């Protein structure tokens, strides 16, 4: 309680209803791995989707609460736990774009995904970032350079650029190395 009052860091988020299952995992294994891997304590409300992430006496990484929180959001925005675990690497961040802020929605989703997900895969390969398209958002994991490349390409597709120029754009940015 001394510790509770003077040191505990706590974060609160809310993930969509049908991702709750995924966050928990079979026998709670997924939540337990996040907890284990970040030395945090995660509390999930099965009805409302509210999640609480807090530090513990055991917590060793000062930024861990925030990393755990981000993995929770990534899972919430369509990433699988395996893919969300990328956020434990140094200097990799999660960025959530609201499609509705750019733009018809279902159509833009399909332009980002591409036939058989070819567009998503090319964006991931060329930017180096991980991309999840889900509901009204597209979420990207990577370092800021990787994020800015994927972000730009995704925005181009939303604003109506033909696929060709997007790939050429990606081709251009990679060539800057």
């Amino acid at each position: 309680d001394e510790w509770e009052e003077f040191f505990k860091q706590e974060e609160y988020v809310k993930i969509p209803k049908d991702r709750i299952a995924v966050l928990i995992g079979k026998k709670g294994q997924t939540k337990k791995e996040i907890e284990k891997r970040t030395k945090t304590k995660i509390t999930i409300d099965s009805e409302t989707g509210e999640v609480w992430i807090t530090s513990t006496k055991e917590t060793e990484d000062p930024l861990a609460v925030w990393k755990a929180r981000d993995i929770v959001l990534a899972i919430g925005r369509g990433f699988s736990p395996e893919r969300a675990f990328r956020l434990l690497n140094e200097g990799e961040y999660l960025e959530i774009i609201n499609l509705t802020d750019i733009i018809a929605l279902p159509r833009v989703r399909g332009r980002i995904i591409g036939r058989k997900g070819r567009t998503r895969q090319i964006i991931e390969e060329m930017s180096g970032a991980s991309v999840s398209v889900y509901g009204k958002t597209v979420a990207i994991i990577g370092n800021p350079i990787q994020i800015e490349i994927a972000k730009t390409a995704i925005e181009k597709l939303a604003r109506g650029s033909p696929h060709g120029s997007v790939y050429r754009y990606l081709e251009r940015r990679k060539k800057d190395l």
Binding site: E2, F6, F7, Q9, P62, L63, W66, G91, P144
Partner: protein
């Protein structure tokens, strides 16, 4: 180096005597303060140990400060609920800012004494609370720090604040 009259501080009870206690101030390393028995509670205190234990952490008000002699007096009774709550929020935000700054230092290869001298001190002087500096940078861009800290800190402070501090 010393807190101000009227400032709320986090402190640790180090010694208890019959008519008072000595506390070390957590945010002013090695600085000791006195707390008279009459400042421990709003009711009459018969035994201090009913209210204080060696090692206990406390939010307390600074009621008297003499910097030439290095005397500091504290009071526990004068702190209101709201004041306790605020100070505790403010203390937790100072732990974040410090962790954010340690991370920026590691990224840039500067030791912590430098980070303190080049970033912490000047930001504290100007915004009053380092976390607040970061909150401004998050809302209006890292450029708000330009001038207060060496330019080489901006790119990395930028990456860290943008990803970790919400705009209020």
């Amino acid at each position: 180096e010393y807190p101000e009259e009227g400032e709320f501080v986090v402190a640790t009870v180090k010694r208890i005597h019959n008519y008072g206690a000595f506390l070390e101030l957590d945010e002013y390393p090695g600085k000791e303060a006195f707390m008279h028995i009459s400042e421990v509670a709003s009711t009459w205190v018969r035994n201090i140990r009913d209210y204080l234990k060696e090692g206990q952490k406390v939010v307390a008000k600074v009621i008297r400060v003499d910097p030439r002699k290095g005397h500091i007096d504290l009071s526990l009774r004068r702190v209101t609920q709201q004041q306790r709550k605020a100070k505790l929020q403010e203390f937790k935000r100072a732990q974040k800012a410090e962790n954010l700054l340690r991370l920026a230092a590691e990224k840039l290869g500067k030791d912590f004494e430098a980070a303190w001298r080049e970033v912490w001190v000047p930001l504290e002087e100007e915004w009053g609370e380092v976390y607040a500096a970061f909150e401004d940078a998050a809302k209006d861009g890292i450029e708000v720090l330009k001038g207060h800290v060496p330019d080489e800190w901006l790119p990395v402070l930028k990456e860290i604040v943008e990803n970790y501090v919400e705009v209020p």
